[PDB]
Symmetry: C3
């Protein structure tokens, strides 16, 4: 099967600040040697649901995977509705190999003191927009295989960083399309 996703509902599945305070909408569609990805993030409860002037303007969502491409429980995203697509839900409560969706380790090597600088190609940096308002940019940084947390074999992280005061708003961002080279 060719799509791994969170499902497209709004049921919380993620930790921005506290457990299951947010919905990460993530779809990874296998296109041969690349995955076509689509992501967005919504705070449902907790600090990011009604930001203050002191809420930290830098949020990292970590997906850590094992040797089989299966999500580790220490990830920010819950394993419960992260699986292969079946209709607008997921195939079952199971541990299905997903190595063909994992980021290529040659393109995106793990950090190593071998070389101090990792290659910039391990990241994608762009802007998305808070509240879908054109004057409210948020930087999205997607990083591949840059985590070493908990013995992970692969990782995809999504960081959202900004400078403007978005106090008294709900964190919610426009959708972002991306791709990356896959392992096989």
């Amino acid at each position: 099967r060719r799509t791994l996703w969170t499902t497209p509902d709004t049921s919380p599945n993620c930790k921005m600040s506290t457990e299951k305070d947010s919905k990460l909408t993530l779809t990874l569609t296998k296109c041969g040697s690349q995955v076509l990805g689509n992501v967005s993030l919504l705070a449902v409860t907790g600090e990011y649901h009604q930001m203050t002037a002191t809420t930290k303007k830098d949020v990292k969502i970590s997906l850590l995977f094992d040797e089989n491409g299966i999500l580790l429980p220490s990830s920010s995203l819950s394993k419960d509705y992260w699986n292969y697509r079946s209709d607008d839900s997921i195939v079952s409560q199971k541990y299905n190999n997903a190595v063909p969706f994992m980021p290529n380790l040659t393109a995106y090597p793990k950090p190593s003191a071998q070389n101090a600088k990792n290659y910039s190609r391990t990241k994608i940096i762009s802007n998305v927009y808070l509240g879908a308002l054109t004057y409210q940019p948020v930087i999205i940084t997607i990083a591949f295989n840059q985590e070493t947390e908990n013995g992970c074999a692969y990782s995809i992280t999504f960081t959202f960083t900004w400078q403007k005061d978005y106090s008294a708003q709900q964190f919610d961002v426009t959708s972002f399309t991306f791709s990356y080279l896959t392992q096989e």
Copy 2:
């Protein structure tokens, strides 16, 4: 068939200001659970072909679809050369089901007073560039299923919004790649 498009010629097919004043170049390629889209817009005649200081710096192009995924005549885009790909033209003068190209209604629900705020994930916001000049950004906003005009079941709209004075130029923008989750 896996691509719906306008064809890649420059024959006017769209209304920015007046009927058939512009060429919308749009290609939607089905990649499983996502469409890979590519869009751009050129004013051939009318106000946007030679903008003035008062030309409105906000243009919305609406594609409205019925229950079968077929374009409604009240759309900004003409039905005549919007169809499935056949060579660098289209398969025929016909009404072909296209539900698998439509934006997913769970990911991108229609507006409803049920909840005041629609989800920001229903939009993509980025920049394209007028005249392909790097100092001339134009905001592109792509919105999925946010129209209710004329009983539509689905919609894709492309809005172009800017602040700089582009008077005495022809509206024409760089190409923009995007994706979205599909209905089945």
Copy 3:
């Protein structure tokens, strides 16, 4: 076969300033009527490896192709490891037709004094980020079929243009995803 690439290693394959001073990481994945592309560029030696205040802040990488979609030797990119994917390397030392990966000549016509202005849709313009640092934007311009150098039938060029002083840094940029309409 459905992917043409440089391979994902870091072995220099490109000229920014001098021959084989850089690694262009480029993957072109055929998705029907579009290619899904992914690019980045790293200076390994030469001026761009340790920029000065006078290093030119505009770098054009040219891929020129013949009638068969095969890379011309006068391109910036070396032919040696540019080929169809086989594992994380390439299929062989050969000249394999690649017309289905070439940019569509109707969408992206060659320049002609027929019409002074080429269509802006022949370019993609966006930002990538030097060193994967969010405060270091670099403009990427991707252009399709705009070269006439050396009798080429098709071309893809990647230009990187910036204004900030990045002296004493190594040129290296985040990855950029794009698509374009193909020839058949």
